[PDB]
Design a protein around this ligand. Structure first.
Ligand SMILES: Nc1ccc(/C=C/C(=O)NCc2cc3cc(-c4ccc(C(=O)N5CCC(F)(F)CC5)cc4)cc(-c4ccc(F)cc4)c3o2)cn1
Ligand SMILES: Nc1ccc(/C=C/C(=O)NCc2cc3cc(-c4ccc(C(=O)N5CCC(F)(F)CC5)cc4)cc(-c4ccc(F)cc4)c3o2)cn1
Lengths: 466, 466
């Protein structure tokens, strides 16, 4: 079973011997520090509160096991068995901590307070920063949900220019990242952060996470359609690629189907196999069940353009009201190789220069969507800003001489709306002056109980585009 | 509870209707595809065999739950209920699969087969590639262990040159990445892969993973020392940084202690606080308990060089047998900000240029060691290379015209030793000719059971440097 006594940075085990004596309160905050990515989607804290922090988390056996492990780890006795036994006997193992956050789904500019942590018992001054390590890991669902939303902005801009509406926007980016992430638990959390902005996912693990910790009115938050891989094509033999194509579109003639076509020669497959030999099985398909050709190699922009030119000469093309070319409704294209936020912008801009509408194409991303992200992308940081010693409170901060970008905020913090409708974080307890309205932070956790929750439905609504 | 029926890519559920009819065998393999990082460390397979693949993995309840989820996910009933009911009734929920693999810890050049997967029942031809997604995730411990070993190579070269031996090598790179990874399960896997090469870690979760799935002779595989953070220094007050230093070094006066010193001015704390105000508490410390000064901001190379020049003028410096300068044995330095494999080489080369020995310094890394890594750094890939249909086996392969590097191998594979002592992978069953000796892969999994395993002590021995 999970042991919260073994889920911290090793060195923090010794921090109860370094704080100033006669200290009764430690107050810390989380932010996406200022330095692209000017606003962040706050999401994922609710998952950590329920799975790791709520309820009875301390037992006599868990204290004894931490004592045994840390004895050999440090080659010394340094564990705070006395402090952890006080929580067990007085609060039945419930953590005496209060956490205030911003509602999940909110879009907030860089450099503002997103949540605060503090202890509610003077004896547990050391407990505030013990749970820093587990809490800081919220940088991952924040960054996945932000980076996915910024890719939605690019897609929405070019779809509106070339078509005149946003029909089908919310399944133009499919999640191919299950096998490209570092673990099973990461796959579930990352695919859920992507479903805040889109609807298509191949990463099954994200569905069960949402229903267990968030919930939705619909049966499932994500959907998929049948598709082929290189094994189900090459298994027929090099000389029988056309046999594998005919068989697969016939088994799935009533639903959409994606077919990877670059096993040997992608341009041969589009012009000769799809566009001639099997053309009669494509033009008869329904608008609700098109064929989706999938290239998978080469230069991403050059391959998409050459593919569209080949298909345009073999199938009837129309011109929409904005002047851009459009394929017949029974034929589309999906590009799912080498796709990140940078390449996605290069592709749609190139398609627009060649007078091709964004209606024709959708995208898929694997490692770029779920794995190629770090904690310094948005500079997520956790720092102490207020302590009480000998009954008097002081403001605490850091300010390295060689880097003013690492300066931290001072005192008790609060988040408010500006008169022009923006955000501002007030320091040194100045929010008590009541000049900026109501603090937008809400108590989500106190003394081992989750005091306020949000559904996955409200979160999607909070993260909408303008 | 984990359900293997929900731990695959969505599309793989629709693959049992796409293979050629009368197919009784699907045979697939894993490689680090060829085109820095010329050889890879194979580690991580055993963890996945025990936690997810062995034993009764199919029940009547798990079949019904996967059925219910897929009807909403696909808006159809494509799920293969009949295939999974046969495995339950015929094999008591045990997977009829055989896996062969190279011994864990082995160092193998790029472009060689590392493990193979095939079905042992003709009815379960679809099972081989169903477990591709879970097995491909072994890319992460392989890449962490490889990138960590390459960093050990750089440190060994410059330590031997500036000092004359390798004393202290196994803890010159400490793992700081607990808070910087994407989940709790990722932290345990990645820290365990780092301990293959080094012995210092702050990510506690790696210790329990090793003892449960690999085992070691000693009580624990990793160690740590007491250290400060920014909250335990700045909580004393801006004008009281000296008081915090004196307290911390007195509480830990008999063991090594690391003290972050860049809260306000790193260069002032080195020259005036450590080098003047508190110098009498440093020169009295034991060689087994030095003070370790830790900078944490600015340019990594420029800061380290200036910190060394300051201390060299406040403390007695000697010259070792190779001519390089050395601090007194009670004074060391650790640099744990912005360290990856690129900057680690720049720092160590610049230290040598200024005649400073590598004995004076250690390093720590967080996001660069455990998070800033993807699946295409080593080109880890899983592909089918052999099937049997109508009783006749054929060689299958992919070969895209726009990317010769994506070409895969054909037929039954085997790994052998060359007469000069190198590795070669034989294709198309040519290993049966017995011209290259015996196959180096070993059956590690068969019909639901682990058939061969390795201890963490054997893995470390196999992964040693030349
Ligand atoms: N490692 C890997 C893993 C996988 C792969 C290759 C995967 C692949 O090719 N996927 C194709 C694909 C999925 C998909 C899902 C949707 C989709 C998403 C959401 C909804 C939805 O909101 N609802 C459906 C259910 C409902 F009830 F109807 C109301 C709500 C519907 C469909 C749409 C298209 C599509 C793409 C391009 C097109 F042109 C057309 C469709 C889709 O295309 C490669 N490597
Ligand atoms: N998010 C985070 C997390 C942490 C931080 C800052 C952390 C910090 O400052 N850590 C200091 C530190 C630990 C440490 C461990 C060892 C160590 C590791 C392994 C062994 C070992 O091999 N064994 C244990 C004992 C044994 F019994 F022999 C068997 C084997 C011994 C020591 C050595 C030094 C050191 C650093 C610099 C020096 F100059 C010298 C030492 C060490 O220094 C920042 N952000």
């Amino acid at each position: 079973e999970f042991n919260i006594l073994l889920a911290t940075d090793s060195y923090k085990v010794t921090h109860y011997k370094q704080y100033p004596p006669n200290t009764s309160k430690v107050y810390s905050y989380f932010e996406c520090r200022e330095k692209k990515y000017e606003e962040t989607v706050f999401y994922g804290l609710q998952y950590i509160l329920n799975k790791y922090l709520k309820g009875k988390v301390v037992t006599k056996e868990k204290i004894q096991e931490a004592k045994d492990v840390y004895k050999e780890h440090f080659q010394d006795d340094v564990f705070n068995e006395k402090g952890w036994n006080y929580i067990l006997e007085k609060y039945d193992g419930h953590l005496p901590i209060e956490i205030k956050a911003v509602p999940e789904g909110f879009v907030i500019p860089r450099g503002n307070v997103l949540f605060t942590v503090e202890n509610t018992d003077p004896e547990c001054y050391w407990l505030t920063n013990w749970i820093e390590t587990i809490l800081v890991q919220s940088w991952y669902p924040i960054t996945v949900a932000t980076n996915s939303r910024e890719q939605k902005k690019i897609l929405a801009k070019y779809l509106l220019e070339t078509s005149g509406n946003l029909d089908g926007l919310e399944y133009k980016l499919h999640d191919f990242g299950y096998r490209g992430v570092s673990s099973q638990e990461t796959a579930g959390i990352g695919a859920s952060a992507h479903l805040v902005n889109f609807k298509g996912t191949d990463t099954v693990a994200g569905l069960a996470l949402i229903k267990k910790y968030y919930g939705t009115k619909d049966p499932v938050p994500g959907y998929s359609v049948p598709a082929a891989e290189h094994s189900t094509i090459t298994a027929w033999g090099k000389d029988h690629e056309k046999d594998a194509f005919e068989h697969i579109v016939t088994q799935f003639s009533s639903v959409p189907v994606s077919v990877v076509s670059d096993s040997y020669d992608i341009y041969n497959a589009c012009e000769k196999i799809w566009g001639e030999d099997l053309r009669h099985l494509i033009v008869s398909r329904s608008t609700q069940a098109p064929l989706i050709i999938r290239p998978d190699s080469g230069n991403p922009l050059d391959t998409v353009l050459k593919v569209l030119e080949i298909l345009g000469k073999k199938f009837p093309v129309t011109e929409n009201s904005k002047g851009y070319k459009l394929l017949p409704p029974y034929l589309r294209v999906i590009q799912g190789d080498g796709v990140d936020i940078n390449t996605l912008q290069e592709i749609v801009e190139g398609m627009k220069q060649k007078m091709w509408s964004i209606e024709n194409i959708a995208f898929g991303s694997g490692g770029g969507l779920l794995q190629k992200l770090t904690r310094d992308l948005l500079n997520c940081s956790f720092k102490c800003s207020y302590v009480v010693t000998n009954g008097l409170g002081i403001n605490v901060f850091k300010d390295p001489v060689a880097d003013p970008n690492k300066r931290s905020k001072k005192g008790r913090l609060s988040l408010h709306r500006t008169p022009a409708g923006n955000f501002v974080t007030l320091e040194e307890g100045k929010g008590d002056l009541e000049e900026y309205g109501q603090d937008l932070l809400h108590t989500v956790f106190k003394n081992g109980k989750v005091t306020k929750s949000y559904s996955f439905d409200e979160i999607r609504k909070n993260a909408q585009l303008n």
